[PDB]
Structure formats: C-alpha cells, structure tokens
Amino acid sequence: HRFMEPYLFGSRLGQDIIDLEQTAAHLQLALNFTAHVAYREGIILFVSRHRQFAHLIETTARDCGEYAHTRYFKGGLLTNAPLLLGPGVRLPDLIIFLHTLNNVFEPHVAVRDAAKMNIPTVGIVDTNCNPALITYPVPGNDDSPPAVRLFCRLFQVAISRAKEKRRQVEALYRLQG
Amino acid sequence: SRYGPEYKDPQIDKEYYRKPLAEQTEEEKYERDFKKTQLIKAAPATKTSSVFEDPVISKFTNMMMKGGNKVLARSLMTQTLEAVKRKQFAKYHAASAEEQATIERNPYTIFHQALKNCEPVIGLVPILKGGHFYQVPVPLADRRRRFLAMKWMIAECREKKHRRVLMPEKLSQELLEAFHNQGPVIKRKHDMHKMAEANRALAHYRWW
C-alpha cells in the first residue's frame, strides 16, 4: 500500500521488510493506551475478519473479559446501534483490530464506523493495509501464527495488568477513608 | 390428481409375487419397495388380474368408447371378437386339410397381428421454417405408433361404412384385411411412408 512506505525498512528480494524500531515505538503507545482504557473501565472490542485465528481471538477476549467480533460484521452495527443491539446500548470505548482487511482484501467496515462514531482504534497493519483512519497503528505481520499469537498475548497481559492495578488502587481507596 | 406424488403404481401381475425366490435382482427391489413407506394407488376398475384380458384390447375398447358408455364399448368389442371367430371358423370348415393347418382362429393373435401390420414405422411432424410448414420425417415412439395404428382403423370403420352395417360387422372384416395386409388402413400406412420418403430430404430440419 502507498501509505506503508514510511513504515518499511526495505525490500528483501520482492518481499517488503517492516522495520521493528518503529514497530516497537508504536506498540508501546498502543499497549499504553489499551491499558489505560482498560484501567478506566472501558469496553474493549477485539475485531478481526480472518478465518484462521478467530477462535484464538475469541478465547483471548474471553480470558481478557473484553468483547470480540470475528464473524461477519453487520451493516449498521456501530452506526445503527440503538436498532441493531438494543434500545439503549453502550458503544465500545476501544476497538483493537487484529486483521484490518476482511476476506475480500478490502478495508474493514468498523475501521470506518469507529472513525464515524469517534471511537479510538488500535490496529495491526500489514504492508497492504490502510492506516489513515486507525488511531494507533502498529506496523507488523498479521498472517503468521506466532505473529498473531504474540500480539494477542501482549494485549492479554496488558488488559490483565490494567484491571489488576485498578483493583489494587481501589483496595487502597478503601483504606484512605 | 387426488393421489400425491408419493403414491406409486400398483403391480397386478400375480406371477411376479408368487415366485420371488427365483431371482435375487428382484428381491433387493421388492424388499425395499415397502420399507420406505411407499403408498400405492388403488387398482383401476378396468385393469384386473384376469388372464383373458389384454391391455391392447382394453386400450382399443377405451378408444372406441363414446362418452362414457363403457358397457356399450365392451359389447362392441366382444361382438367383434365373436364375429371374427365365426368368420374364421366358416373358412376353416370350408377349406381343405392343407389350409386348415395354416388358418388361424384365435382372435387375439390376429387382432395383435393386424395392429402390428398397420403400425407405422415413421411419421411426419410439421416444422415451421421460412414461414412455411414442412412435413419432416420423424421416428415415432412405441405408444404413438400403436395409438396411430388403432386410431386409423377406428376412424376408417366409423365413417367409411354403410348405415345398415354394424360396428362389429365392419370391424371383423377390416381386422382380417389388416391381418392379410390388404386393407385401406395398410394403404394409409403406405401413403404415410411414401410421403415420408418424398420428404426424406427435409430430415435435416429436425434438431432432436
């Protein structure tokens, strides 16, 4: 993608190589933001349309106590929420994208609906993705099983640590008075 | 139409059921015919398990039946068979010993042979090509051949007879003529074959 040139290190005989210095520099901010929103009691939704790790993402969101969408994203889910989900529904406070493109190799619907609904979006972008609308892009690989598992475990430990430090802060809140 | 699509046709042949242990290919079919909860239609009043009836005679009687006078059609058929029997017996008793072994008195065999004799081989279909209908020679089916063979005889014996002559009296004569390959029904079949031979070159107009 044309918007991937600044996030690339080079080309190793046809295959583009993503640099890891900027990868880690973006991942630090992404993990900090997701940990802060999980600390402030924020709804976090792991979105990914990829028929290989959908079960891994559902199990990761279940172990995190956050919500997941790895299935066919309906049309008016985020925009027409008071008619798609229920009378009065609380929209997710963070959307984490484990695969930006769907099975048609086009940008996801939620990557535009979150920008339409003013919802922060963290997203793992490959060399063929479009990070223009993603709030926190992380230039990496989303097609290798260990690459997906590394990001899923990093976000798992981030949400776990955030909720645990929140419970500890409330424990001291109960002793301050 | 009151029968659903699941209703199957009944089997009247008693010999088909009397000896099932004589062949194994039929066993695998008749042991599962009833297992699938396959419903069977009611047997028609016209078709029964008698050995003195034939589907060809039943079809000819149904084609001769006007309106719904089936008793009248059956009377005409029985009187026709009796008339051909007596007309063959007269010639059996009037011929010598050499022709007695060649003359046939069984009415069913001569009826079937007359029908097979008037059965056409190929027919004509009107095909519209260039705004004009061409009579293309087409191979006929078995049911169409037998239906035409019966219909030609019935249509001839219904109109080309005198008012004083009765239906069985005319049909008995035309049956023997068709059995000996002399009747106008055989002439009509030959005319059909000659027209098909004259339009044999138009057989390329067919697409099936």
Binding site: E41, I43, L45, H55, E58, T59, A61, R62, G65, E66, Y67, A68, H69, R71, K74, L77, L84, L85, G86, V89, R90, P92 | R2, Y3, P10, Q11, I12, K14, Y17, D33, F34, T37, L39, I40, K41, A42, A43, A45, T46, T48, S49, S50, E53, K70, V71, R74
Partner: protein, 328 residues
Amino acid sequence: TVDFIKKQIEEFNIGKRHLANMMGEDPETFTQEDIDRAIAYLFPSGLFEKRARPIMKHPEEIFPKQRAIQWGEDGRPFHFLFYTGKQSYYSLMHDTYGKLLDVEKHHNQLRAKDLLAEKTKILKDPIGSRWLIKEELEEMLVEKLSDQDYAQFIRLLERLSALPCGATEEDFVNRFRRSIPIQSKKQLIEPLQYDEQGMAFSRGEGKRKTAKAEVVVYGQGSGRIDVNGVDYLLYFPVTQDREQLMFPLHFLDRLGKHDMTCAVSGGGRSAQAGAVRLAMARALCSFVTEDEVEWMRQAGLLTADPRVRERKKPGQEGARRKFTWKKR
C-alpha cells in the same frame, strides 16, 4: 417484560385454584387436561380455528421466550459475544469449535501413544435420530436464526460426529437430536372370529365413490357371493363388475374356498363393485398369511379410492369446463 410475566403467573395460579373450586375437583390434582376440559365446557366457543378458542395455560407457553437483559447497570454487556448480533448462536458455534479442537488434540495424542479405545457412535439408524430443524433451534436459542448459519452449524455437528467421540462430547451432541413417529404402514389384521358355532368368520368394510359395502366372509364354505339377498350374477349383470369381484379372489387363489355375503348401498354399479371389492379385500386379510396381504396392498386391494366427484364452481359448467370465452 420480566415482571409482567411474573404477575401473570400468580394470576394464573389464582385462576387455577378458582377454576378447580368452581368445577368441584380437588385443586391439588387439577392438571392441564382438566383445565382445558373445564374451559371447553364453561366457554363453549364453536370456531373452526383451534387457536381462536378460549384458552388458559401457564404464561410460559402463551408468551414467547423473552430475551434476558444483556448489560448491567453500568452498561457493560454480560456475554463476550454481545457485539456480534447473535450472542447465543455464535457462542454455541464457538463452544462446538472449542470441543472439536479438544477432540482433535486428544486424538492426536492418542495416536501418538498408539491407543484406540473409541468407537463409531454416529450411526443412530435403529434409534431413529435426526437433526434439529430451524424452528427447533429458534426455540432453544431465543434470538432469531437464518438458513445459512443453521446449515453451517449442522455441517459442523457432522464434522464433530465424524471424529473419535469422547465422553462429554456425546451427551452434548445428543441434545441436538430428535427421535422420529413409527415408520411402519403395516395395517392391523383382524383376528379370526367364531360366532354361533361358525368357524373362519371375518368381516370387512369398504367405501368408494359414495358407496358403503360391508362384507362377511366364511372360510369354510364353497365359492359364492350373496349381496342384498340376491346372487352376484343377477346383481352385477355387467361382466366388468363381476370381474371386480373376481379380482381380489383370483389374487389369493381362494375362488372355490370361501363363501361371502355382502351389503352394499349408495352409488352406482361400478362404485358398488369397487366398494365391495375393497371390503372383500380388507376382509380376506384374516384368512391369509402376512406375506400375501402385503402383496394385496402392493397390488391395490387394501387401499381406498379417494377419487370423488369435484364440486361444480360458480361461473363454470362442470367444475373444470369454463364458459365459451369470447375474445372480442
């Protein structure tokens, strides 16, 4: 509507006690077969549609399955698949896939250790098991369903049933199974009756085209028929009607082995011949073994003739023949 149903259940219990009081039965043994029986008497509504009649049941059959609350007081949803639209169906699919992967890993480890202790527990033909229909799945999952997702769930259930089954997997796959009525069209055979020191006495009933025929058969007499007091030769002058009488007897080769007396009414000559044919065929089943009565029903003797004259329609001639339609 969680509280409304709760109040309706209390009102229904009070109505049940009052109904048992006014009907005079013990309210303890008062069940639904007495509730509907008392409603049918107290409010005798004559209507053709059964759902329009007065009915008083427990509110859980009257009111449909209401969806439970999905989020707490703080707004956070309960289930982790709430933002998928179908949080029950997708959770069922997720559990099915999680058990499929568990069976896969356990069978891989068992093949690595070279042990085969599982069997084929998918063939449930003698039990008569089937899969759930879309309505049966829409009853379990309160939310609505579609066709493609139901076919995907069934195609995943067969994938799970095609693998070496575990212990807790069989009881999970069984709960989506339904047992199918009796797949047997075998008719009931009347036993041989003996009345007034008469041996081999049976009876049959037939009906075809507004013609009722009752035929009694004695298996000890000679071959002859007595209909309405007069013999069959004088009652059926036409050879076709007598051939209808010969049809069921010639099929069993019992021509000169049974005496029969029939009583036919209504219809015409061929309708009476077909009614007595069906009655004689249904009455001859007692004198014959089980293999030949099946050939009778496969030859068309034991089945009725539903071909009844259609009613003439207004504006037509013979219920099919239309009037002469003039184009201009």
